[PDB]
């Protein structure tokens, strides 16, 4: 509840939708802005750097997201907002499992399949991707468990 | 228990010549038909104009069907 979360999602377009669906569900409950452990006083130097406006919409409520289409500007600044503990949830794409300089308490892996459109089928994740995603649930000193 | 089977074939004759009514309608018509062919005191030529008039004038081959109903009835 009060510890970092990475939500790995199948695609570049699923991460924005899931970063909004976490927020509509936390605003469905009365605990809106429960994923922002800092204040909006502290987010404006990090929110004024970004290009994706809906990333600012989701980050101001405490849920960042990450995919290939973001710039490493936005990617490194969301990773810095997440490593500091300012936000609590980062919804990262499946292909960013290798490239994340951050590790959470809870890693949710939503839907371990992805649409290979060359064969028109939902191929499963290779287990090395799922093992790296699982290994992102590893905060050595801060966490008793992962 | 074998009064009940002539009772059921009387219900089924009423259901065929009267047309799929509830249980109390058919059993009240059963009481009516059996207690009106028993209480004729064996008056027989008057039974068409009451009872097939009730059952809608099928024809008198079903009247000689319905004679055997009332025959096979009996602090």
């Amino acid at each position: 509840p009060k510890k970092p979360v990475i939500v790995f999602v199948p695609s570049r377009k699923q991460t924005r939708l899931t970063a909004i669906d976490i927020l509509t569900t936390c605003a469905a409950d009365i605990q809106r802005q429960r994923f922002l452990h800092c204040t909006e006083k502290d987010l404006i130097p990090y929110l004024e750097k970004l290009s994706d406006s809906t990333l600012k919409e989701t980050l101001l409520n405490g849920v960042g997201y990450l995919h290939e289409g973001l710039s490493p500007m936005e990617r490194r600044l969301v990773e810095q907002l997440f490593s500091s503990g300012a936000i609590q949830v980062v919804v990262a794409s499946r292909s960013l499992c290798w490239g994340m300089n951050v590790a959470a308490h809870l890693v949710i892996i939503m839907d371990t399949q992805y649409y290979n459109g060359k064969i028109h089928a939902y191929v499963d994740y290779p287990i090395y991707d799922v093992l790296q995603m699982v290994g992102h649930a590893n905060r050595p000193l801060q966490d008793d468990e992962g | 228990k074998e009064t009940r089977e002539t009772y059921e074939v009387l219900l089924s004759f009423i259901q065929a010549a009267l047309g799929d009514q509830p249980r109390d309608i058919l059993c009240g018509a059963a009481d009516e038909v059996l207690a009106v062919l028993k209480n004729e005191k064996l008056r027989d030529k008057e039974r068409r104009k009451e009872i097939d008039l009730l059952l809608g004038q099928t024809d008198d081959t079903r009247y000689h069907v319905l004679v055997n109903l009332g025959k096979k009835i009996t602090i």
Partner: protein, 907 residues
């Protein structure tokens, strides 16, 4: 805090028929008289309300231009439609139109549809069809099938696809993805929302239109309360607004349906009393008084004769009866009485155009029952006669040639043919779900009496309602705005609570109390505490009524965890969904039915015991075997092919042989027995699918073969030893019985030519068609590439090759298959998975990679059965043989963490 309630105490046992009112106060000139064995209660034609001095029938040239294309043929609007064109087109408020039946409520729904259609106008084109969906929830299915035609005609100029939600869940999610106006029953839309096949298009649903929302009073009430509590709760949680348009009949507690629909009673609530009915009906009520039911039946026939003869030459009459046989029975009965009293020529005077059209239309007719009546004025219309012949009756009655139409209720839903006089004869329908002769519903009576008075010719409707006298006050309260709409949700509260638990909408008892606050039961419990088992002491001690909602949630959750549907702890109040919960929610079977299927389903059940486990469903708890059909049941029990362990005077044997007499297509004769058969099979679709899902989830391979086969046998209405060419309904049945007579295996037909087939059946004319239909039959060719991953796990890469010609008229958008991988004994499914063969991707291989476990007594095979989810005798088995399978060695154990004292960096 929680106190367990008596949940069957609080229900209304009459169901659709419960009267909340003690008094029924009538209009002014509304006398009653005890004539002879019946009391006749007239209620006169209410004069229409005189027009407001600044209120007029606006034309269609004053509503906005995007909506003018929907109102073709309409110069002006109705009065009720003119009162709320501004609230249905200019405002996005939730509406509750409480109009009389027949007063143009579907054009109000069309106005709301045109507002939501008019938000996607796409300036150079016409309609952006794929950014919105409109749900039209109408109570009866034939009303849905004619609303599909009406909205398909009216929205044809917009290119809007209107369709009806039918078929299996894949067909329903394809029909949702393809269409804009989705017309459905409340139960079909609710079973889609429970199974989840609209979840991708609920951000696209912007308008649900609840036609006939006084179904809240019906026993189908909890479905509508669950639908609206779910939609309103998603509006309060997800915050995407859907517009709810409830169309109702003018009945009391309309302000509670307004609060239930989140309708603001200023802007959205419109209550038009029965004066605003377009053709004002003089309504007569014959309540038969005497207490011997055969005299009541004779008096009812005398009353339909007298009320027919009251409108003999003057007006058309639409008699409404309960059964299809009763239709011809009382048509011939009033014809025999008119021929008896020599009043037969009053209908057909020598109006030689009319009687000549009737005579030459009679001699053309194929229906020998309708040919008996059509030379005179009389005719029949049930759903059992031909489409040609029943539209012949429709068009001959709309041209004032048929003087007396007799019909079942379905015409009143299916067709908008109104008559001057309607005469509802009897008000007694045999409902098999209660297993008895119950009264006609509020819905069916209000719809039958909306056909009184046609809006073209008639200045005054006339609706005679022949009833028992004790049931007279119910229909007087119903048709005169005095039968209150009360919630029936305590009947089905554990099932709707389980549907909210399964969907994840409620998680603990607090969210379940929050959801119960959105129901109609909460508003009715707030406004009328006494009727729902609440004292005023309890409303003064709990004004928002939260402890009663906790007690209802706790009682329903005790019903859910007793029947193992929900893991419910009384400590924290949290719910956990069980897979029996998912199956009972997905297939609508009650909590007692899944407790029956949890007790009774073993892996070792035969096909004999499977019909018995089906027949002990709690959906059939009111099915009793009456003695008047027992003889016929014996004639079924000696002919049904699966044996029945029970004796025939036990009800489970009746449900057993009725399901088997359905699948065998045995002709039944009793009306009660055909009605019980239709009921048990329309329940048997979902019940057998729920048994199949329970059995498949627990992994029992023999019973999942039996249950999936029995799903497809109930659906296709054939036994699986019959020819698979009966699932193509386009074949002649004589050549199919010639194929079953010459009993070779069906797979022999694949290798033959179209000459060779036709001379094997000795039907050389039919041979090319048999070849086309045997190659239209679904047939997958499987190949396995197995690779031992560990000693315990194999990776099976199953390539599925469609070896059948796809055709959209027989297969549709998709063919669904089950891939079941099972052991040598075929009694444990090691891996089941669903496989959609989509129509874009026929004729090409599908790689399905999965991992199956392999245990220490190394089996000689596994079996991959790819069966059809829909088609009988569509199964490809492939033995994955483990003869030359060299498993990898059992790997060495990992190196242990020796508990070294932890290494300082100075090391």
């Amino acid at each position: 805090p929680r106190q367990v309630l008596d949940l069957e105490d609080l229900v209304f046992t009459q169901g659709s028929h419960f009267m909340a009112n003690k008094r029924c106060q009538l209009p002014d000139g509304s006398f009653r008289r005890q004539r002879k064995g019946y009391e006749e209660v007239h209620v006169p034609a209410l004069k229409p309300k005189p027009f407001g001095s600044e209120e007029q029938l606006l034309p269609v040239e004053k509503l906005p231009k995007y909506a003018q294309a929907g109102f073709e043929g309409f110069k002006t609007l109705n009065r009720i439609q003119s009162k709320l064109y501004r609230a249905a087109l200019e405002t996005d408020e939730n509406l509750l139109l409480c109009a009389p039946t027949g007063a143009g409520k579907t054009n109000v729904a069309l106005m709301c549809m045109l507002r939501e259609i008019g938000k996607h106008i796409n300036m150079d084109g016409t309609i952006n069809v794929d950014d919105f969906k409109i749900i039209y929830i109408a109570p009866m299915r034939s009303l849905v099938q004619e609303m599909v035609g009406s909205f398909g005609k009216r929205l044809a100029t917009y290119g809007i696809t209107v369709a009806e939600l039918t078929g299996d869940h894949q067909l329903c999610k394809e029909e949702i993805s393809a269409t804009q106006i989705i017309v459905c029953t409340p139960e079909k839309w609710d079973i889609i929302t429970r199974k989840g096949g609209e979840r991708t298009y609920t951000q696209l649903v912007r308008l649900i239109i609840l036609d006939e929302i006084h179904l809240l009073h019906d026993d189908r009430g909890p479905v509508l309360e669950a639908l609206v509590a779910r939609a309103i709760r998603n509006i309060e949680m997800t915050q995407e607004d859907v517009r709810l348009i409830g169309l109702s009949a003018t009945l009391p507690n309309y302000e509670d349906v307004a609060t239930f629909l989140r309708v603001d009673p200023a802007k959205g609530l419109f209550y038009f009393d029965n004066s605003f009915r377009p053709v004002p009906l003089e309504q007569t009520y014959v309540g038969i008084t005497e207490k011997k039911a055969i005299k009541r039946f004779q008096i009812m026939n005398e009353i339909v004769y007298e009320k027919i003869m009251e409108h003999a030459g003057k007006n058309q009459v639409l008699v409404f009866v309960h059964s299809r046989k009763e239709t011809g029975k009382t048509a011939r009965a009033i014809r025999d009485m008119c021929l008896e009293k020599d009043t037969l020529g009053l209908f057909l005077r020598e109006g030689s155009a009319s009687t000549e059209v009737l005579r030459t239309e009679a001699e053309q007719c194929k229906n020998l029952e309708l040919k008996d009546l059509l030379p005179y004025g009389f005719a029949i219309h049930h759903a059992g006669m031909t489409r040609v012949d029943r539209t012949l009756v429709e068009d001959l009655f709309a041209d004032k040639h048929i003087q007396v139409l007799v019909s079942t209720a379905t015409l009143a839903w299916g067709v908008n043919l109104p008559a001057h006089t309607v005469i509802i004869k009897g008000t007694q329908v045999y409902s098999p779900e209660k297993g008895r002769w119950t009264e006609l519903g509020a819905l069916d009576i209000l719809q039958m009496l909306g056909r009184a008075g046609r809006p073209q010719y008639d200045t005054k409707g006339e609706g005679i309602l022949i009833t028992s006298h004790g049931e007279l006050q119910y229909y007087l309260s119903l048709l005169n705005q005095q039968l209150p709409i009360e919630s029936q949700m305590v009947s089905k509260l554990p099932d709707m609570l389980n549907a909210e638990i399964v969907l994840g909408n409620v998680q603990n008892a607090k969210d379940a109390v929050n959801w119960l606050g959105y129901a109609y039961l909460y508003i009715r419990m707030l406004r009328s505490p006494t009727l729902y088992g609440i004292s005023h002491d309890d409303l003064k001690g709990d004004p928002l009524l939260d402890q009663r909602r906790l007690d209802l949630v706790h009682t329903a959750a005790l019903m859910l965890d007793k029947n193992n549907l929900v893991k419910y702890d009384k400590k924290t109040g949290n719910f956990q969904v069980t897979e029996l919960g998912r199956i009972a929610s997905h297939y609508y079977i009650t909590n007692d039915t899944v407790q029956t299927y949890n007790q009774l389903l073993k892996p070792t059940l035969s096909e004999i015991e499977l019909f018995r486990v089906f027949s002990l469903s709690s959906e059939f708890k009111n099915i009793t075997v009456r003695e008047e059909e027992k003889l016929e049941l014996q004639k079924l029990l000696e002919r049904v092919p699966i044996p029945v362990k029970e004796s025939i005077e036990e009800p489970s044997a009746k449900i057993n042989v009725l399901l088997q007499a359905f699948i065998s297509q045995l002709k039944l004769e009793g009306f009660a027995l055909m009605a019980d058969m239709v009921y048990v099979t329309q329940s048997a679709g979902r019940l057998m699918r729920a048994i199949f899902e329970i059995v498949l989830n627990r992994g029992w391979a023999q019973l999942t073969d039996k249950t999936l086969n029995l799903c497809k046998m109930i659906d296709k209405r054939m036994w699986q030893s019959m020819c698979p060419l009966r699932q193509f309904r386009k074949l002649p049945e004589e050549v199919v019985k010639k194929i079953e007579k010459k009993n070779f295996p069906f797979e022999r037909l694949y290798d033959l030519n179209h000459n060779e087939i036709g001379e094997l059946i000795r039907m050389p004319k039919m041979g090319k068609t048999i070849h086309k239909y045997v190659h239209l039959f679904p047939k997958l060719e499987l190949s396995v590439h197995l690779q031992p991953i560990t000693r315990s796990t194999l990776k099976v890469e199953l390539t599925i090759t469609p070896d059948f010609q796809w055709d959209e008229k027989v297969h549709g958008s998709s063919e669904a298959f089950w891939i079941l991988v099972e052991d040598v004994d075929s009694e444990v499914i090691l891996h089941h998975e669903y496989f959609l063969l989509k129509a874009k991707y026929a004729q090409d291989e599908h790689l399905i990679t999965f991992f199956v476990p392999v245990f220490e007594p190394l089996p000689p095979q596994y079996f991959i059965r790819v069966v059809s989810d829909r088609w009988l005798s569509c199964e490809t088995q492939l033995p994955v043989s483990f003869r030359h399978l060299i498993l990898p060695e059992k790997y060495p154990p990992p190196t242990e963490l020796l508990d070294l004292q932890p290494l300082p960096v100075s090391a």
